[PDB]
Scaffold this active site. Structure first.
Site, short mmCIF file in Angstrom:
data_model
loop_
_atom_site.label_atom_id
_atom_site.label_comp_id
_atom_site.label_asym_id
_atom_site.label_seq_id
_atom_site.Cartn_x
_atom_site.Cartn_y
_atom_site.Cartn_z
N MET A 41 -9.43 0.48 -13.89
CA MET A 41 -8.34 1.46 -13.63
C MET A 41 -7.76 1.88 -15.00
O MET A 41 -6.77 1.32 -15.49
CB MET A 41 -7.25 0.89 -12.73
CG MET A 41 -6.27 1.98 -12.33
SD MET A 41 -5.22 1.53 -10.96
CE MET A 41 -4.16 2.94 -10.92
N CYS A 67 -3.85 0.56 -16.15
CA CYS A 67 -2.92 -0.15 -15.25
C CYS A 67 -3.08 -1.59 -15.61
O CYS A 67 -4.24 -2.07 -15.61
CB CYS A 67 -3.40 0.06 -13.81
SG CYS A 67 -2.56 -0.96 -12.62
N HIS A 118 -4.89 -3.91 -13.11
CA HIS A 118 -6.19 -3.39 -12.75
C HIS A 118 -7.06 -2.95 -13.91
O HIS A 118 -8.14 -2.37 -13.67
CB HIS A 118 -6.03 -2.26 -11.70
CG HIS A 118 -5.34 -2.71 -10.45
ND1 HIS A 118 -4.53 -1.92 -9.74
CD2 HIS A 118 -5.40 -3.93 -9.78
CE1 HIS A 118 -4.06 -2.62 -8.66
NE2 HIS A 118 -4.60 -3.85 -8.70
N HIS A 146 0.79 -1.09 -9.18
CA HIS A 146 0.20 -0.39 -10.33
C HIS A 146 1.28 -0.29 -11.40
O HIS A 146 2.50 -0.27 -11.05
CB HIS A 146 -0.28 1.05 -9.96
CG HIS A 146 -1.32 1.10 -8.91
ND1 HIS A 146 -2.58 0.60 -9.09
CD2 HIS A 146 -1.30 1.64 -7.65
CE1 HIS A 146 -3.33 0.85 -7.97
NE2 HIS A 146 -2.57 1.46 -7.09
CU LIG Z 1 -3.35 -0.46 -10.69
#
Ligand SMILES: [Cu+2]
Length: 99
Positions: A92, A84, A87, A37
């Site tokens: 995210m 992120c 993501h 992340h």
């Molecule tokens: Cu992430």
């Protein structure tokens, strides 16, 4: 305030996804599960006068282990979206309201 990167069940979420903080409170993003992340702020969804480069990790910089943190303190009031990088396309993303 602490924000987890990844839910305990492996979900690609910030936890919490939305929250408010008074101006200048440290926000501690804490790597939690379902790596890698990182945390960046969206230059199109922050208050006018905010420079996202000062408050974002480099996109190339990833957190691969539980308990790493990324710490930031937001001084300008308004709404900010963070995401992120790996993501972002999986949803995210989160919103902090600085008041
Ligand atoms: Cu992430």
């Amino acid at each position: 305030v602490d924000v987890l990167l990844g839910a305990d069940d492996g979900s690609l979420a910030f936890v919490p996804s939305e929250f408010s903080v008074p101006a200048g409170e440290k926000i501690v993003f804490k790597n939690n599960a379902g790596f890698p992340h990182n945390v960046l702020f969206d230059e199109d969804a922050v208050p006018s006068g905010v420079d996202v480069s000062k408050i974002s990790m480099s996109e190339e910089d990833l957190l691969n282990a539980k308990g790493e943190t990324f710490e930031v303190a937001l001084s300008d009031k308004g709404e900010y979206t963070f995401y992120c990088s790996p993501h972002q396309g999986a949803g995210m993303v989160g919103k902090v309201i600085v008041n």
